[PDB]
A paper describes a structure:
NgaP2 was active against GalNAc-β-pNP and had weak activity against GlcNAc-β-pNP. The NgaBf, NgaBl, NgaLy, and NgaP2 activities were similar to those of GH123 MR-β-NGAs, as they only degrade linear oligosaccharides with β-GalNAc at the non-reducing terminus. The strict MR-type activity of Group 4 can be explained by these two loops that completely block the −2 subsite, forming a pocket-like architecture at the substrate-binding site and thus preventing substrate entry. The structure of NgaDssm (Group 3) bore a striking resemblance to that of NgaLy and NgaP2 (Group 4) (root-mean-square distance of Cα atoms [rmsd] = 1.5–2.3 Å), while the structures of NgaLy and NgaP2 are identical (rmsd = 1.0 Å). Additional structural analyses (comparison of crystal structure with AlphaFold2 predicted structure of NgaCa, comparison of apo1-form and apo2-form of NgaCa, and comparison of GalNAc-thiazoline-bond form and GlcNAc-thiazoline-/apo-form of NgaAt, NgaDssm, and NgaP2) data are illustrated in Supplementary Fig. 13.
Beta-N-acetylgalactosaminidases (β-NGAs) hydrolyze the different β-GalNAc linkages of various glycans to modulate the length, combination, and abundance of glycans. The overall structure of these enzymes is similar to that of CpNga123 and BvGH123, which consist of a β-sandwich domain at the N-terminus and a (β/α)8-barrel domain encompassing the catalytic region. Among Groups 1–4 and GH123, the DE motif is located at the same position, suggesting that these enzymes adopt the substrate-assisted catalysis reported for GH123 MR-β-NGAs.
Residue numbers in the entry: 18 to 576
């Protein structure tokens, strides 16, 4: 006689822990637009150990549907000291995060809730395979999920009803970069940088990025000078070929950059974000730069070459005009961004100025972006486009700074949206609504796939170490895991795309009904105005808000 077995259908916004009771309420309905990725999960529990469950879905949406297992990752540093009351947990342990192919095997483990995650990637209406009335406002499709043991006995089932609203979620216009660490791919898969095997993996990772709303890619002219200790290095990742012809004299080749840019174009990246040309913590030094003299490679710049020295000045006087010629020849003039150095403090205003001044002699007319969360520094007029943290953005909104950009990282641990393991899925997804309300033009994140320790002192295994060796709250350094042939998603990466989908849906309702009505619907029944710091951290609020937006779109009078 069969083991006992229970199921509960849930939204994408639950995190099901294997060591706790499940309080979440069942969710068996939702709505979506064409070209939207709609996700849900089913939790299940048995008192027995049941190995290699057979899980299947039956739906007209089967061509668009994937099922994955929600795996557990360790976190030794889930929180910084004194986590606010909105954290879902504070103790080290195992957290639901990675999403594994079902082919990898799925088990019921005694008296533990586990989950399977369902992704429905909807096409355009014109590509949809099932018959659907082109004149309907929406059509509902059942999705039935079935659990059986290894030997074909039925254990459980859940039915989900997805309503597809017959309008398209419009193309994303928000600029969105998640810094891509090519080096981390090379060291994890054990391939040489810019080998053909490395290029193939790069393509897989970029494809995943684009699919999750990344339209701007960090482009390593020289080894990005990021997360490296003073006097330290990361593996050489350098698209520019440099030949030393004599003292302070160079020649350049851009053929590997041209390969990179063509890859970007082909995979759907729209903007090229060139890597920083000076070090972190005040732009005092050059990046690591490698050059050939007489066939042989040597390091010509780095932590022993001051950024304000004439040597690095003369190098950029030769390089930058040649990069500008490349840009113009490839019709990239309005598609590029440059970086100086992030978050210069007031004590570094002078070194930042001297660095920024070098670029300004050559890069007139181009967008130059830098993380900058201090409005008093911004008033000095040294940074062109500031990228303030979402916990520091208030004075940039108050003063009408344009274009408005935001980021978050490990430092944004209080109140605001983030993507830590120990934070709820609503506190991730709500970013979409905040971006909408404040008219943000771009969002930046440092950690697509950062798989080293703090300061890149060692390589870590991201399946075992999720906090960069007790430096950053787990979830901060990476949203993808290394699968055998390409990325594995986290539930947090799926939920972040949902926030970008909410932004796109809000902008659609704005096109149909205007901004005043859209913003009023979004803030209906809130006790406090929506800000980057103040929102309901609540599954029911967010789901019912997006459902209202969808119904208002469905009901809108259309041209
Ligand atoms: Br958008």
């Amino acid at each position: 006689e069969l083991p006992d077995f229970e199921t509960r259908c849930l939204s994408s916004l639950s995190k099901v822990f294997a060591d706790a009771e499940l309080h979440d309420l069942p969710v068996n309905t939702g709505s979506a637009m064409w070209k939207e990725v709609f996700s849900f999960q089913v939790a299940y529990r048995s008192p027995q150990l049941i190995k290699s469950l057979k899980i299947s879905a039956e739906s007209e949406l089967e061509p668009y549907l994937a099922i994955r297992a929600v795996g557990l990752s360790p976190s030794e540093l889930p929180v910084f000291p004194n986590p606010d009351e909105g954290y879902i947990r504070t103790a080290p342990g195992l957290y639901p995060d990675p999403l594994y192919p079902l082919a990898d095997g799925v088990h019921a483990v005694p008296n533990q809730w586990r989950s399977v995650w369902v992704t429905v990637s909807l096409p355009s209406m014109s590509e949809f395979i099932p018959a659907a009335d082109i004149g309907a406002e929406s059509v509902s499709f059942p999705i039935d999920l079935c659990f059986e043991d290894g030997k074909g006995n039925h254990l459980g089932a859940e039915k989900f009803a997805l309503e597809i609203i017959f309008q398209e979620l419009p193309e994303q216009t928000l600029l969105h970069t998640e810094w891509f660490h090519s080096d981390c791919i090379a060291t994890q898969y054990k391939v040489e940088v810019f080998s053909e095997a490395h290029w193939k993996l790069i393509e897989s990772y970029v494809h995943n990025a684009v699919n999750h709303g990344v339209n701007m890619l960090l482009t390593p002219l020289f080894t990005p000078p990021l997360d490296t200790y003073v006097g330290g290095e990361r593996p050489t990742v350098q698209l520019i070929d440099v030949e030393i012809t004599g003292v302070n004299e160079y020649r350049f080749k851009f053929d590997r950059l041209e390969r990179w840019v063509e890859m970007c174009q082909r995979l759907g990246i729209q903007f090229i974000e060139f890597s920083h040309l000076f070090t972190q913590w005040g732009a005092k030094y050059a990046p690591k730069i490698i050059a050939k003299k007489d066939g042989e490679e040597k390091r010509i710049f780095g932590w022993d070459t001051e950024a304000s020295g004439e040597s690095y000045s003369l190098f950029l006087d030769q390089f930058l005009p040649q990069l500008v010629h490349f840009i113009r020849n490839h019709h990239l003039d309005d598609k590029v961004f440059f970086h100086v150095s992030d978050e210069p403090g007031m004590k570094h205003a002078e070194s930042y100025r001297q660095a920024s001044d070098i670029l300004n002699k050559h890069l007139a007319g181009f967008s130059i972006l830098d993380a900058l969360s201090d409005y008093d520094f911004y008033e000095k007029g040294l940074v062109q486009i500031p990228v303030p943290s979402n916990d520091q953005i208030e004075p940039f909104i108050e003063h009408g700074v344009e274009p408005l950009w935001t980021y978050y990282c490990c430092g944004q641990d209080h109140h605001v949206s983030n993507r830590f393991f120990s934070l709820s899925s609503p506190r991730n997804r709500v970013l979409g609504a905040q971006l909408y309300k404040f008219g943000v033009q771009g969002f930046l994140h440092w950690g697509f796939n950062f798989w080293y320790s703090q300061y890149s002192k060692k390589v870590i295994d991201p399946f075992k170490v999720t906090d960069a060796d007790c430096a950053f709250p787990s979830g901060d350094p990476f949203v993808v895991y290394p699968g055998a042939d390409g990325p594995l998603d986290s539930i947090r990466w799926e939920v972040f795309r949902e926030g970008l989908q909410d932004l796109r849906a809000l902008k659609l309702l704005e096109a149909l009904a205007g901004r005043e009505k859209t913003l009023a619907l979004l803030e209906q029944n809130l006790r406090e105005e929506l800000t980057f710091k103040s929102f309901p951290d609540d599954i029911e609020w967010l789901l019912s808000t997006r459902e209202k937006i969808n119904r208002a779109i469905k009901d809108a009078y259309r041209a």
